[PDB]
Amino acid sequence: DSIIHIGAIFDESAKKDDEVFRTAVGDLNQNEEILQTEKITFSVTFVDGNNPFQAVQEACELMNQGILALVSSIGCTSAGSLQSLADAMHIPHLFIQRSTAGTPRSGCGLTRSNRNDDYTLSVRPP
């Protein structure tokens, strides 16, 4: 029985992020010191990162399965929609900003509505 389940939403260009995500879960599930009696399970979905409705829909399907946190590796286009969904549903959102085609990162500038509690944690530095 697993009580520790996490969700992940990846851009279609982020196959290496999925490989490393699965390896990291593997490495932790072999660590006896952390989570001594509990294995981490997960559900991963790939989406078009230029389709914000698809990103919301698939993130919502992961939340229907039941998750403790949502990890995303995606560009700015769907980032605002995932952050606002995470705020509405109270799901901790670990956001890894991907740049397009190896271009230098700029801030997303999503200007997320600040009336509600922010459930997004930005994993990459400013």
Binding site: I4, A69, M89, H90, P92, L121, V123
Partner: protein, 62 residues
Amino acid sequence: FHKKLQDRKWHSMASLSCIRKNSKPWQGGRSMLETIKKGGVNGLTGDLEFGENGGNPNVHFE
């Protein structure tokens, strides 16, 4: 998650629904977010942690 399970503050995951009449947030979510936010680990990037603004502050350029 390890700290939440070793402090007897676990909230079970819930099946949530988006865009429904009785859509409701995860009741465990606020306590989980605060536990993750004040977490810190040594990893492949160096040190991963979050400031008050919810962002990782740590970066080095060569």
